[PDB]
Each structure stands twice: as structure tokens, then as C-alpha cells.
Specification:
The PDB classes it as hydrolase. This protein is an alpha/beta fold and about 500 residues long. It contains 15 helices and 17 strands. Strand 2 and strand 3 form a beta hairpin. It binds a molecule of 2 linked components (NAG-NAG) and the ligand CC1=[NH+][C@H]2[C@@H](O1)O[C@H](CO)[C@@H](O)[C@@H]2O.
Length: about 500
């Protein structure tokens, strides 16, 4: 069918731009030249990151950026399009550091979207930056607009969309039109900020790239998988904040959509998006991490899963104890809590004391260091088999990942994703998706196909009775009901009739 999107972040800090070199990994660990022609062919999008919104309320580079060096770096990325006529070099505005609630630039995000005039100036600046530097689209990663700010955010996305469409016409770019994406929340707490208006958020986008990772971290009491596909009943559960969003739904409607507590998983986030009317599966992109999250002070018994831990949650990491044995990149980056897949492979291969274990419910690997009490949750080419099959079964738009520098030197994670979507000889028809917990919620946008006998006027229906009526299958919430389905509050729309 339609090719699945494969969207990889290229993140480069300002000091690495300003000192850019392709021949000294101690200055720039992952220069553009490491994205070989083979890797460029396996990507559909590279998200160059991160730009910001400045105090003038315009899209802008970090003001410390050497502009000549920035253009050189971007030009090296756009040169890769010679190897892949489908490849887009997007640019990403925001990210956690700039745009989180306490981030250095947060007020600029709030203010840029707040009024019609601000939105026009902001939208114009986005497209100007896109054209000036040669990017192929705009990606906005505000983490995250609050419920009160959502209407302005929506209007800003709509305005950027119109300007991008104008630019596509001006440049004759119908074969590769300029695109608009966002990085969206991948867990219900942040998602609840804008969930009620999800259809309006997604309408102007080519894709919403779900950040379906960081679902565990040092801010939680209990270690867990950070990107479990399905749930493990032995693992923690979470309050379903979506049931408190301003939806206007009834008790039965909320309960059917938002089981609580629930397992915080990739499947949960995807299904939460599909449950909403007007959110098409083809626009949902599943994010995956190319890094693991490491915890210390864990107990034994279950390989470090679901244990208390003593991992500092502060930023920056508060001391110089780099306790993730074998993680040389952690020493370089002064933080033992995150390890690239590239580094995790070496840690497993060296004499460092790790076991690689597998949770067959979550379909994800983890490392356990029994002697020191360490636990690492990460993803690999095996967990990507199940996630790729899920992407195909659920008819999602594709996959996104953070970030390209964390794949191994040979690009094995990217090559695996490309194989699972595109290789003619790859067969996952027999890949068993397991018995992990699925998110069972149903909403207006994901009604299952059902059959039931036609509703009969005058018949007295007991609680739980199912009838077909006017294109849908309905269930009584109590009994005895004689009203026509949809005419009052007694009937729940539970399914749709096949065409
Ligand atoms: C919002 C999301 O998808 N993930 C959030 C994390 O990005 C964030 O972790 C922080 O990310 C920064 C940007 O990469 C790092 O500089 C910072 O070290 C890191 N902090 C920690 C403790 O991991 C966390 C922070 O609470 O929130 C996630 O939700
Ligand atoms: C889409 C993307 N932007 C965010 C998000 O990924 O999580 C990353 C890893 O936690 C973080 O570094 C970044 O600021």
C-alpha cells in the first residue's frame, strides 16, 4: 500500500553547529556524513532539531548559532535528497528544554499563539525559516500547550498549513508538498491537556508523531518499561486522566472509553487517539526510542522490573557518579540515566555484568545488572518487529524515532524498521503478538463492526440488550427501555453496521 513514514530526528546542539566537523567525534559525535546513502534511502523524513520561538514571538535559531555554520549543516542534510526523491528534511521547533512548562522559552510559545496578529507573525516566520534554509516542512514540538492555550495552538497550526500550501503552489511542489507535523504526547496525562480537541489539532497535519516513550523514568517511584507495547498485569497502573477531559460525554461513554487505572503503553496511546472522531489512523505515527532509560538501586526478584530505585530525577544530573557500568557515552554526557542503543550493545558485549532479558507481555527487552542493582528499559530490533506489525495492523502512518545518533554505527535499528515495512522477503504473518494487556477503550472514532436484531417499537428491552437501528448497534444502559435508539439517554451506541 502507501509507504510507511520513517521519521528520524537529527539533533545537534548549538555548540556542535558552531564547531561543526566531520572528523572529530569528540566535538561532533554524529555528523551528517554518518547518514550514508543507504540510511537516507531508509528514511522518509529527517527532523532537524531544535529551533525555538524567540521573545519577538518568531521561529528562530538559538541566537548563539553561527549562521554560516548552521546553513552548512542544513545543506549537508538537504544534499541527502539526491539519494532519495521521497526524503524530506523537516525542522523542529521546541522540544523539552525550550518548551516545557518551566522551559527557558515557554512564555514565547504561549504568547506566539495567543492572538490573531501573533499567530500571523509566528506562522509567517516559520515558513520564512523553512524557505530561507531549504527545509521541506515544519514540525512543532511544544511539550505541551495547556487546555486554555489549545484554541490558539489550533489556529496557529491552521494558519501555518495555509501558508505551506501557498508555498507548495508557488514552488510547484505537488510531488513533494511542504508538510506540517507535531510531536504529540504519548501518555494520557500530558495528552489530557488537548485531547478534547484532538480532531482540530490533527486536521492541518500530515502526521501527529506520538512520543510513545519516556513512559517510565526517574520521576516514577517504580521502575517500568518506558515504551511497553502492551501491558503487564504485574507492572504499575495509572489513573486515566482522559476521563476528566472536557468532552461533554456521559458516565457510560466515559467509562467505556477510559478504563482506569490502566497500563501506560504504546497501544494505549494509539488507541486513545483512534477513539476520537476525525482522527485518521493514517496520520498517527508511533514514536520509538533509540535509547534506554537506566535506574540504580533496584531490587532483585523480577530482573529489576517494578522495583523501587534510587535514581536522581533532577536536571542536570546532580553529581559525578556515572554509575551505569560500561556507558562511556554517559561519562561524556555527564548523565548515567540515558544510554543510546549504540552504547547498550557495547555494554552487553563487554565484561560489564548485564543480562539481556525479555518481557513477552510488553514485547520489550531490558537489561539487569544483578550485582549492582541496575535496570535499563530500551527497544531493539526484536521489539520493533512487534511494533512494526502493530503499525501495519492498526493502519498507522508509520514510525518516528529519537534520535539518529543513537542507532548503532551500522544503522541496524533503522534498517530493521525499513525491512519490516518494505522487504519483500520479510514475513511477520506468524509473529505472535502475545497476551499482554490491550487497551480496551471504545469511543466514537473506533466503533467496532457489529450485528444485532433490528429495533422493534413496543418491545421492552432489558439492561444490556443489543439492537440495530439507523446504521448502528445500540445497547440499553438500564431496563426496561422502549424508546427509539438515539432519541434519549437510555441507549449507548456501541457498534456500527457494515456497509
Ligand atoms: C515529554 C516527553 O515525551 N518526555 C519528557 C522527557 O523529555 C523529560 O526528560 C528530560 O529530557 C530532556 C531533553 O532531552 C533532558 O535534557 C533531561 O535530562 C531529561 N530529564 C530526565 C529526568 O530524564 C522528562 C522530564 O520530566 O519528562 C518527560 O515527559
Ligand atoms: C520528539 C522529541 N522531542 C522531545 C522528545 O522527543 O523526547 C526526547 C527524548 O526524551 C527529548 O529529548 C525531546 O526534547
Amino acid at each position: 500500500s502507501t509507504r510507511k513514514a520513517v521519521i528520524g530526528y537529527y539533533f545537534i546542539p548549538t555548540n556542535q553547529i558552531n564547531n561543526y566537523t566531520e572528523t572529530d567525534t569528540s566535538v561532533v559525535p554524529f555528523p551528517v556524513s554518518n547518514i550514508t546513502p543507504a540510511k537516507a534511502k531508509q528514511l522518509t523524513h529527517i527532523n532537524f532539531s531544535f529551533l525555538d520561538i524567540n521573545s519577538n514571538l518568531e521561529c528562530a535559531w538559538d541566537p548563539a548559532t553561527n549562521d554560516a555554520k548552521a546553513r552548512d549543516v542544513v545543506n549537508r542534510l538537504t544534499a541527502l535528497k539526491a539519494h532519495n526523491p521521497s526524503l524530506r528534511i523537516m525542522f523542529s521547533i521546541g522540544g523539552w528544554y525550550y518548551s516545557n512548562d518551566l522551559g527557558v522559552s515557554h512564555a514565547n510559545y504561549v504568547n506566539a499563539v495567543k492572538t490573531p496578529a501573533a499567530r500571523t507573525k509566528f506562522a509567517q516566520s516559520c515558513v520564512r525559516i523553512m524557505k530561507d534554509y531549504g527545509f521541506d516542512g515544519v514540525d512543532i514540538d511544544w511539550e505541551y500547550p495547556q487546555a486554555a492555550e489549545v484554541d490558539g495552538f489550533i489556529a496557529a497550526l491552521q494558519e501555518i498549513r495555509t501558508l505551506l500550501n501557498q508555498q507548495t503552489i508557488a514552488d510547484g511542489r505537488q510531488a513533494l508538498p511542504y508538510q506540517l507535523t507535531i510531536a504529540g504526547a504519548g501518555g494520557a496525562f500530558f495528552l489530557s491537556r488537548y485531547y478534547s480537541k484532538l480532531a482540530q489539532i490533527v486536521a492541518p497535519l500530515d502526521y501527529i508523531n506520538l512520543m510513545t516513550y519516556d513512559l517510565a523514568g526517574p520521576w516514577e517511584k517504580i521502575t517500568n518499561h518506558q515504551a511497553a507495547l502492551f501491558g503487564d498485569a504485574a507492572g504499575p497502573t495509572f489513573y486515566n486522566a482522559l476521563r476528566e477531559a472536557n468532552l461533554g460525554w456521559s458516565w457510560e461513554e466515559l467509562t467505556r472509553a477510559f478504563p482506569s487505572p490502566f497500563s501506560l503503553t504504546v497501544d494505549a496511546a494509539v488507541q486513545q487517539h483512534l477513539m476520537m472522531e476525525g482522527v485518521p489512523s493514517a496520520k498517527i505515527v508511533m514514536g520509538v526510542p533509540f535509547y534506554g532509560r537506566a535506574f540504580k538501586g533496584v531490587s532483585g526478584g523480577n530482573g529489576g522490573q517494578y522495583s523501587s530505585h534510587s535514581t536522581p530525577g533532577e536536571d542536570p544530573y546532580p553529581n559525578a557518579d556515572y554509575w551505569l557500568v560500561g556507558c562511556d557515552e554517559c561519562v561524556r554526557d555527564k548523565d548515567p540515566r540515558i544510554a543510546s542503543y549504540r552504547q547498550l550493545e557495547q555494554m552487553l558485549q563487554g565484561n560489564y555484568g548485564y543480562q539481556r532479558l525479555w518481557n513477552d507481555k510488553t514485547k520489550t527487552p531490558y537489561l539487569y545488572h544483578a550485582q549492582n542493582g541496575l535496570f535499563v528499559t530500551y527497544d531493539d530490533a526484536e521489539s520493533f518487529k512487534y511494533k512494526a506489525k502493530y503499525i501495519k495492523q492498526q493502519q498507522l502512518g508509520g514510525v518516528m524515532f529519537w534520535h539518529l545518533g543513537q542507532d548503532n554505527r551500522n544503522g541496524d535499528l533503522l534498517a530493521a524498521l525499513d525491512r519490516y515495512f518494505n522487504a519483500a522477503d520479510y514475513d511477520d504473518s506468524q509473529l505472535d503478538m502475545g497476551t499482554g494487556l490491550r487497551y480496551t477503550g471504545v469511543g466514537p472514532g473506533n466503533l467496532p463492526i457489529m450485528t444485532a436484531p433490528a429495533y422493534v417499537p413496543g418491545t421492552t428491552y432489558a439492561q444490556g440488550a443489543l439492537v440495530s437501528y439507523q446504521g448502528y448497534v445500540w445497547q440499553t444502559k438500564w431496563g426496561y427501555i422502549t424508546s427509539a435508539p438515539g432519541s434519549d439517554s437510555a441507549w449507548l451506541k456501541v457498534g456500527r453496521l457494515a456497509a
